[PDB]
């Protein structure tokens, strides 16, 4: 027989992590691996249809994606849907698939609104999720002995689909659910200048542990303003939620990184200010299989799509897709091994959930909620040469923290500052 896979991704724009120019080679590699493996679907072939989820302007929209999904369903009637990545575009498509009882597979849309299975049923997310960041934050708070208060700030920028809104809300909800502590939040505009002054005036009266979701340039400007005002690392700590590693180029294997220098004439001041800043990023795979997959992915993409890919954590987004696809195939086989049909949906989704799989990224696990557990990394600056390096890794499958080569998380004073000063905020 034939198996149809429907993809709803931007086929023209090549600026998104889930763009077709970076996913198509991964899908081709997954199909080749499935064909070369007699274990997965013996005697069956897999097809693929594509649809555009962007308007004339070239950006993902919540109007074109549902129409494309409906047209694909009417014309081909596929068994599984791939994508989209944008939350506003994927959510109506997810609801449509749930109503149609058609399984949905994705690695994007990490918004908390997809965490409820009553509405978004038969939906699997094989990519990173914002709840795992909240779990990492809770684990770090438990390890560092902070249980009183926290402060949250996020920046608003016109042009994107509120990148620092869903992440902040999901992490905030997860912290409230798990830690049961008082947490505040605030939104600021990075374009304005008086907003920074108001932020530096209001931070000392709201807390001492601050999480910031903004651009690396905005973070550097805020850190410089804090240094000039009088803020020091002995009482304040700053965390930057750079999941894709923009401040540090790529976030690849070990190499000296100096995000405080850009040749603006104030490199010394930025270097001194960044003594109290840490970055939270994703964890790159270490097995050579990941390197080989990256090499083949880059080669095939260059030869077949006229696109030149770079080195970074963004490449971890399409790869998960690949792995997820493989998992789906296995589940189908299990259904075909238990006297079933490929048009059930519920059985395949139930079999996929709460399962351990091995892929190019490594050993992944899917819980009962259909959300892949992701590892995280914390970057710290070397006090000697002033370069950031990886010092702590968090495993979500076992929820544990591990150091790297015995590295010690140094502090300006000697131990982490207390969550609330003895004199209080007054």
């Amino acid at each position, epitope marked *: 027989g034939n198996l149809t896979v429907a993809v709803v991704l931007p086929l023209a724009n090549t600026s998104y992590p889930w763009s077709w120019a970076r996913v198509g080679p991964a899908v081709e590699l997954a199909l080749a691996q499935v064909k070369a493996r007699p274990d997965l679907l013996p*005697g069956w072939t897999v097809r693929t249809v594509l649809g555009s989820s962007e308007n004339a302007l070239g950006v993902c929209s919540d109007t074109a994606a549902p129409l494309a999904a409906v047209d694909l369903k009417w014309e081909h*009637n596929p068994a599984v849907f791939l994508g989209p990545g944008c939350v506003y575009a994927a959510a109506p498509v997810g609801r449509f698939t749930a109503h149609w009882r058609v399984p949905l597979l994705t690695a994007g849309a990490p918004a908390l609104g997809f965490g409820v299975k009553d509405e978004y049923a038969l939906t699997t997310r094989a990519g990173p999720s914002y709840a795992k960041l909240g779990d990492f934050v809770a684990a770090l708070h438990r390890r560092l002995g902070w249980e009183r208060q926290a402060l949250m700030l996020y920046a608003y920028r016109p042009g994107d689909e509120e990148h620092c809104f869903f992440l902040v809300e999901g992490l905030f909800m997860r912290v409230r659910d798990r830690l049961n502590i008082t947490v505040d939040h605030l939104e600021f505009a990075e374009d304005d200048l008086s907003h920074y002054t108001r932020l530096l005036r209001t931070m000392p009266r709201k807390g001492r542990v601050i999480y910031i979701c903004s651009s690396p340039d905005a973070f550097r400007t805020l850190m410089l303003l804090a240094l000039e005002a009088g803020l020091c690392g002995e009482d304040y700590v700053f965390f930057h939620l750079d999941i894709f590693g923009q401040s540090l180029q790529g976030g690849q294997g070990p190499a000296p990184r100096r995000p405080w220098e850009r040749g603006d004439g104030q490199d010394v001041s930025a270097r001194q200010a960044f003594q109290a800043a840490k970055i939270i990023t994703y964890k790159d795979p270490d097995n050579p299989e990941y390197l080989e997959f990256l090499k083949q992915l880059k080669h095939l993409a260059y030869e077949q799509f006229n696109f030149t890919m770079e080195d970074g954590l963004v490449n971890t987004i399409p790869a998960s897709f690949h792995d997820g696809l493989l998992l789906y195939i296995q589940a189908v086989t299990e259904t075909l*091994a238990h*006297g*079933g049909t490929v048009t059930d949906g519920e059985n395949i989704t139930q079999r996929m959930w709460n399962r351990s799989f091995q892929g190019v990224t490594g050993y992944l696990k899917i819980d009962s909620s259909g959300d892949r557990e992701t590892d995280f990394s914390l970057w710290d600056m070397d006090p000697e040469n002033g370069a950031f390096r990886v010092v702590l890794n968090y495993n979500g499958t076992s929820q544990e923290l591990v150091a790297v080569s015995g590295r010690k998380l140094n502090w300006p004073l000697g131990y982490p500052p207390p969550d609330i000063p003895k004199c209080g905020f007054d």
Partner: antibody
Amino acid sequence: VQLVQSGAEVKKPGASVTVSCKASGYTFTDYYMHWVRQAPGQGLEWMGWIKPNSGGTNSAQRFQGRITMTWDTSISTAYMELSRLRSDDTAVYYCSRGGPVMNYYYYYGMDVWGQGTTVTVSS
Amino acid sequence: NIQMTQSPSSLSASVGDRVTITCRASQSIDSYLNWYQQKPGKAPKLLIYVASSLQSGVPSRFSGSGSGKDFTLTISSLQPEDFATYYCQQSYSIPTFGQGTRLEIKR
């Protein structure tokens, strides 16, 4: 390839009826077994099918409530059990085989059919 | 589920005529269709097992074609033993049977 059935009993509603299907002459554990019921004047009506080697079972939404189908590989026979019989269960039952089990070709048509059995429900 | 429709409901034709029967599905199916013929007092016999093949032991005068949501079963020359009830069944999902199509002679 031979398919043999037996049974023409009539009984009051609320009782149970059993149908035996024999699949001698060919490898019973190498093909699917489909049970199909046809009403006297409505038409054909698919009920369900079983997979002997993998122990698989499939049934319709409106029939899974009160049907239990088993098999015996020692003599290559299949048994169909129906309970909670009403006045709408008076029809003709057929057993047939179709689709190899080495490859999951469940969409293959039923090649060899049975002779059929008649079950009547009345008080 | 998928509802299957047969056209025409009834048709009368003479011996050695060209006849076509159309089967329509409410949902798109690639090639999952089977054609069965049934005579009174006899079990149905399979004719076509996919969209356009021919089962062994079936005369070559029968043909099948179509795709998507519409399929056609064609008989080039009618014979006295070719008058029976025809059913088209889908196999992509939980199988369903059509309402049938009665064929009779012309008088």
